[PDB]
Amino acid sequence: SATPHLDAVEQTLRQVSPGLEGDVWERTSGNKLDGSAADPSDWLLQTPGCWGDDKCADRVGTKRLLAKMTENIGNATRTVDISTLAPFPNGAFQDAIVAGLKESAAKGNKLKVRILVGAAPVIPSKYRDELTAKLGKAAENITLNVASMTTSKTAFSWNHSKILVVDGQSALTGGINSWKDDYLDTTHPVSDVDLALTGPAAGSAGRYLDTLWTWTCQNKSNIASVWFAASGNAGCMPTMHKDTNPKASPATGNVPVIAVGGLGVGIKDVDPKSTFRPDLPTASDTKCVVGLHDNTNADRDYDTVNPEESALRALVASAKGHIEISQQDLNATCPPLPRYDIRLYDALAAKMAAGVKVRIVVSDPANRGYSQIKSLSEISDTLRNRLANITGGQQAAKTAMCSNLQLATFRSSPNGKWADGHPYAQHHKLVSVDSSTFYIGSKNLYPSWLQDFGYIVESPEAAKQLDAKLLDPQWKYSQETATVDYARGICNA
């Protein structure tokens, strides 16, 4: 096959969540990574994009991100569909949205617009009002829905997806919250990444948002769950995408993609079509407390409505050669979450045991918002213990780990910290395998029970672009913090 990695992932998803195929996950063909003619890699919307400079003077990544948001929105003829994590977009993120809506309205277009945020159980009516004011005359052309939502207080579940879909044709998604203080007006900007694509896979994002809004609209009268606000006398629009855009978006290229999300907890309890029978592993050091119900490691029905967890574990399991992971964290704070995803660590262990190389770059523990560990040993100890189950013991585990692991914290320049003295915060949710297939989205690899979304793309060209523009510069600067680095014989773990 031309797509051995997506083929494997797809086969897993059809066993895990068959009743969600089309809505919460979907394989499509005919997509394009949406880069410029001058710089074809600039579909990769990294931020800040200031490699080598501890002052972050020339933020070529931020500039391109904000420009691309406005470009895509400004090309709208029918719909604009946005999700993110609260707070609502502010600063130049909000400026970019407003500029795009005005651009589209001046071209004579009448738009439907949804903006959904997940929140701890902010104020939609105020954001609607702020936006309507800033739109000016353009607001005459726009039907707006704005909502904040919480799906489960006790499982800590709410939207965490960060999506911008225009006309079902273009989509930007990734880890980037639209938070000016963390990303923009700061001399220690968070490092993160979105991608830009067009094609049928953008339609997949639209159908995922219809799923979230269908729940949101159904619960709009429940005060503990949803705060909703619309323009004019407009109603809640649960199926804006299905109602307004083609069931299949137009093809724009030849890139194959799996779109995959999750429903968290409190939307749907199980996929009743699923006959998934997982082999669930055991461990004594993930569930820190006996009271905790562990959805990540011990709830079959949870997996069936959260295909993304399985998709990420299958993407790791597909690797023949090498895996690069860039995350805020691999481990979560317990309670209320378990410390780690056993199956994911077991998948990484299986790969190292077979000589497949694994690089994990996480955020510096000095950030502990943007870190949940005290030391890289909380990751290496765990990988070692899981390797021990399949290599015959602790010594042979340590050897397999030291021979096949790169483990480090993130820097973007020679300096251990930004020049203002703040540690580098990293927030990517990135996995790449074999210079071939990669995930960019909102789903963290640490235990998390939220609504999330992302794309798995099988395109060696784009993955090599990803290498050049992001992973290579990352490892250039980050390798100096490594506790384990097989490429240099370092093994301080």
Ligand SMILES: *P(O)(O)(O)OC[C@@H](COC(=O)CCC)OC(=O)CCC
């Ligand atoms: P993400 O990867 O930073 O954008 O968020 C995951 C993170 C924070 O979620 C929140 O909602 C923080 C409150 C606004 O992890 C959690 O889910 C912890 C929840 C407090």
